[PDB]
PDB file of C-alpha atoms in Angstrom:
ATOM      1  CA  UNK S 219     -25.652   3.333  -8.002  1.00  0.00           C
ATOM      2  CA  UNK S 220     -25.273   0.635  -5.737  1.00  0.00           C
ATOM      3  CA  UNK S 221     -22.726  -1.026  -7.473  1.00  0.00           C
ATOM      4  CA  UNK S 222     -19.967   1.616  -7.012  1.00  0.00           C
ATOM      5  CA  UNK S 223     -17.372   1.664  -4.454  1.00  0.00           C
ATOM      6  CA  UNK S 224     -15.442   4.470  -2.809  1.00  0.00           C
ATOM      7  CA  UNK S 225     -12.375   2.392  -1.984  1.00  0.00           C
ATOM      8  CA  UNK S 226     -11.489  -1.481  -1.188  1.00  0.00           C
ATOM      9  CA  UNK S 227      -8.757  -2.990   1.018  1.00  0.00           C
ATOM     10  CA  UNK S 228      -7.745  -6.424   1.602  1.00  0.00           C
ATOM     11  CA  UNK S 229      -6.595  -8.067   4.831  1.00  0.00           C
ATOM     12  CA  UNK S 230      -4.757 -11.310   6.315  1.00  0.00           C
ATOM     13  CA  UNK S 231      -2.496 -12.278   9.230  1.00  0.00           C
ATOM     14  CA  UNK S 232       1.255 -11.317   9.182  1.00  0.00           C
ATOM     15  CA  UNK S 233       2.848 -14.237  11.367  1.00  0.00           C
ATOM     16  CA  UNK S 234       6.336 -12.948  11.097  1.00  0.00           C
ATOM     17  CA  UNK S 235       5.371  -9.646  12.612  1.00  0.00           C
ATOM     18  CA  UNK S 236       2.194 -10.753  14.637  1.00  0.00           C
ATOM     19  CA  UNK S 237      -0.195  -8.332  13.012  1.00  0.00           C
ATOM     20  CA  UNK S 238      -2.622  -7.952  10.033  1.00  0.00           C
ATOM     21  CA  UNK S 239      -1.437  -7.480   6.476  1.00  0.00           C
ATOM     22  CA  UNK S 240      -3.319  -4.604   4.560  1.00  0.00           C
ATOM     23  CA  UNK S 241      -3.395  -3.587   0.747  1.00  0.00           C
ATOM     24  CA  UNK S 242      -5.450  -0.933  -0.681  1.00  0.00           C
ATOM     25  CA  UNK S 243      -6.274  -1.214  -4.336  1.00  0.00           C
ATOM     26  CA  UNK S 244      -6.010   0.991  -7.114  1.00  0.00           C
ATOM     27  CA  UNK S 245      -8.463   2.892  -9.013  1.00  0.00           C
ATOM     28  CA  UNK S 246      -7.916   2.306 -12.888  1.00  0.00           C
ATOM     29  CA  UNK S 247     -10.267   4.972 -13.682  1.00  0.00           C
ATOM     30  CA  UNK S 248     -11.919   2.941 -16.350  1.00  0.00           C
ATOM     31  CA  UNK S 249     -13.347   4.834 -19.693  1.00  0.00           C
ATOM     32  CA  UNK S 250     -17.064   4.007 -20.049  1.00  0.00           C
ATOM     33  CA  UNK S 251     -20.019   5.241 -21.594  1.00  0.00           C
ATOM     34  CA  UNK S 252     -22.530   7.970 -20.310  1.00  0.00           C
ATOM     35  CA  UNK S 253     -21.845  10.955 -18.421  1.00  0.00           C
ATOM     36  CA  UNK S 254     -21.979  10.135 -14.541  1.00  0.00           C
ATOM     37  CA  UNK S 255     -18.685   9.296 -12.908  1.00  0.00           C
ATOM     38  CA  UNK S 256     -18.482   6.297 -10.772  1.00  0.00           C
ATOM     39  CA  UNK S 257     -17.171   8.221  -8.074  1.00  0.00           C
ATOM     40  CA  UNK S 258     -20.348  10.314  -7.985  1.00  0.00           C
ATOM     41  CA  UNK S 259     -22.406   7.249  -7.647  1.00  0.00           C
ATOM     42  CA  UNK S 260     -20.000   5.519  -5.143  1.00  0.00           C
ATOM     43  CA  UNK S 261     -20.421   8.319  -2.374  1.00  0.00           C
ATOM     44  CA  UNK S 262     -24.459   8.580  -2.339  1.00  0.00           C
ATOM     45  CA  UNK S 263     -25.249   6.169   0.250  1.00  0.00           C
ATOM     46  CA  UNK S 264     -22.069   4.808   2.189  1.00  0.00           C
ATOM     47  CA  UNK S 265     -18.788   6.272   2.048  1.00  0.00           C
ATOM     48  CA  UNK S 266     -17.212   3.381   4.083  1.00  0.00           C
ATOM     49  CA  UNK S 267     -14.482   1.082   2.559  1.00  0.00           C
ATOM     50  CA  UNK S 268     -15.208  -2.520   1.309  1.00  0.00           C
ATOM     51  CA  UNK S 269     -12.974  -5.047   3.095  1.00  0.00           C
ATOM     52  CA  UNK S 270     -11.766  -8.254   1.626  1.00  0.00           C
ATOM     53  CA  UNK S 271     -10.923 -10.642   4.528  1.00  0.00           C
ATOM     54  CA  UNK S 272      -8.727 -14.106   4.521  1.00  0.00           C
ATOM     55  CA  UNK S 273      -7.905 -15.271   7.781  1.00  0.00           C
ATOM     56  CA  UNK S 274      -4.763 -17.267   6.975  1.00  0.00           C
ATOM     57  CA  UNK S 275      -1.481 -16.202   5.722  1.00  0.00           C
ATOM     58  CA  UNK S 276      -0.945 -14.579   2.163  1.00  0.00           C
ATOM     59  CA  UNK S 277       1.624 -13.147   0.043  1.00  0.00           C
ATOM     60  CA  UNK S 278       1.294  -9.392  -0.761  1.00  0.00           C
ATOM     61  CA  UNK S 279       1.301  -9.955  -4.373  1.00  0.00           C
ATOM     62  CA  UNK S 280      -1.911 -12.153  -4.047  1.00  0.00           C
ATOM     63  CA  UNK S 281      -3.806  -9.589  -1.573  1.00  0.00           C
ATOM     64  CA  UNK S 282      -2.787  -6.523  -3.967  1.00  0.00           C
ATOM     65  CA  UNK S 283      -4.104  -8.188  -7.119  1.00  0.00           C
ATOM     66  CA  UNK S 284      -7.454  -9.595  -5.416  1.00  0.00           C
ATOM     67  CA  UNK S 285      -8.319  -5.888  -4.296  1.00  0.00           C
ATOM     68  CA  UNK S 286      -7.652  -4.697  -7.751  1.00  0.00           C
ATOM     69  CA  UNK S 287      -9.733  -7.366  -9.618  1.00  0.00           C
ATOM     70  CA  UNK S 288     -12.724  -6.420  -7.529  1.00  0.00           C
ATOM     71  CA  UNK S 289     -12.439  -2.838  -8.238  1.00  0.00           C
ATOM     72  CA  UNK S 290     -11.977  -3.264 -11.709  1.00  0.00           C
ATOM     73  CA  UNK S 291     -15.148  -5.773 -12.308  1.00  0.00           C
TER      74      UNK S 291
ATOM     75  CA  UNK N 751      42.537  16.912   9.183  1.00  0.00           C
ATOM     76  CA  UNK N 752      39.541  14.774   8.676  1.00  0.00           C
ATOM     77  CA  UNK N 753      35.886  14.812   9.750  1.00  0.00           C
ATOM     78  CA  UNK N 754      34.069  13.862  13.105  1.00  0.00           C
ATOM     79  CA  UNK N 755      31.914  10.635  12.759  1.00  0.00           C
ATOM     80  CA  UNK N 756      28.532  10.087  13.646  1.00  0.00           C
ATOM     81  CA  UNK N 757      28.270   6.625  13.470  1.00  0.00           C
ATOM     82  CA  UNK N 758      29.484   3.369  11.274  1.00  0.00           C
ATOM     83  CA  UNK N 759      26.880   0.729  10.004  1.00  0.00           C
ATOM     84  CA  UNK N 760      27.043  -2.540   8.352  1.00  0.00           C
ATOM     85  CA  UNK N 761      24.818  -3.812   5.719  1.00  0.00           C
ATOM     86  CA  UNK N 762      23.723  -0.439   4.191  1.00  0.00           C
ATOM     87  CA  UNK N 763      21.647  -0.248   0.897  1.00  0.00           C
ATOM     88  CA  UNK N 764      21.161   2.944  -1.204  1.00  0.00           C
ATOM     89  CA  UNK N 765      17.509   3.757  -2.663  1.00  0.00           C
ATOM     90  CA  UNK N 766      15.847   6.358  -4.931  1.00  0.00           C
ATOM     91  CA  UNK N 767      12.571   7.947  -5.314  1.00  0.00           C
ATOM     92  CA  UNK N 768      10.545   6.640  -8.266  1.00  0.00           C
ATOM     93  CA  UNK N 769       8.684   9.614  -9.879  1.00  0.00           C
ATOM     94  CA  UNK N 770       5.134   8.712 -10.500  1.00  0.00           C
ATOM     95  CA  UNK N 771       2.815  11.856 -11.310  1.00  0.00           C
ATOM     96  CA  UNK N 772       1.808  13.335  -8.149  1.00  0.00           C
ATOM     97  CA  UNK N 773       2.952  16.103  -5.874  1.00  0.00           C
ATOM     98  CA  UNK N 774       5.708  14.947  -3.793  1.00  0.00           C
ATOM     99  CA  UNK N 775       5.730  17.337  -0.849  1.00  0.00           C
ATOM    100  CA  UNK N 776       8.712  15.659   0.896  1.00  0.00           C
ATOM    101  CA  UNK N 777      10.921  17.273  -1.738  1.00  0.00           C
ATOM    102  CA  UNK N 778      10.952  20.664  -0.250  1.00  0.00           C
ATOM    103  CA  UNK N 779      12.730  19.283   3.112  1.00  0.00           C
ATOM    104  CA  UNK N 780      14.293  15.844   3.380  1.00  0.00           C
ATOM    105  CA  UNK N 781      12.223  13.050   4.289  1.00  0.00           C
ATOM    106  CA  UNK N 782      12.294  12.545   8.109  1.00  0.00           C
ATOM    107  CA  UNK N 783      14.469  10.134   9.686  1.00  0.00           C
ATOM    108  CA  UNK N 784      12.764   6.575  10.383  1.00  0.00           C
ATOM    109  CA  UNK N 785       9.884   6.533   7.915  1.00  0.00           C
ATOM    110  CA  UNK N 786      10.794   3.251   6.051  1.00  0.00           C
ATOM    111  CA  UNK N 787      10.682  -0.042   7.282  1.00  0.00           C
ATOM    112  CA  UNK N 788       9.044  -2.492   4.452  1.00  0.00           C
ATOM    113  CA  UNK N 789       9.590  -3.896   1.081  1.00  0.00           C
ATOM    114  CA  UNK N 790       6.803  -3.909  -1.493  1.00  0.00           C
ATOM    115  CA  UNK N 791       6.524  -7.820  -1.157  1.00  0.00           C
ATOM    116  CA  UNK N 792       7.994  -9.495   1.789  1.00  0.00           C
ATOM    117  CA  UNK N 793      10.926 -11.888   0.941  1.00  0.00           C
ATOM    118  CA  UNK N 794      11.583 -14.471   3.426  1.00  0.00           C
ATOM    119  CA  UNK N 795      15.294 -14.087   4.445  1.00  0.00           C
ATOM    120  CA  UNK N 796      14.687 -10.681   5.694  1.00  0.00           C
ATOM    121  CA  UNK N 797      14.109  -9.432   9.614  1.00  0.00           C
ATOM    122  CA  UNK N 798      13.927  -5.678   9.876  1.00  0.00           C
ATOM    123  CA  UNK N 799      14.663  -2.204   8.202  1.00  0.00           C
ATOM    124  CA  UNK N 800      15.780   0.916   9.726  1.00  0.00           C
TER     125      UNK N 800
END
């Protein structure tokens, strides 16, 4: 159960606007074996989001894929 | 014989909602003014969106 997440978000610095850039991932709802949902396991111990941080300047496309890859794996 | 004006704006662009399965509540009433300010991916030659 400790491997499941309730949600994942990624962050980086937006130098044009002078704020942070945040992107939320998308839950692929993968079809797997067994009869217990990943969403039942995820809520058991800690409902806070996972945060992927980078301190530099990133493009939106990259941040979105990073959050999605993390969740899928 | 003509209607009264509210305003005149340069650099106007038209956009339409993409129907993806969900409940779009905002179709009951028009989306309020001032909600939108960004592209999905920043392209470097743009400054602000109103």
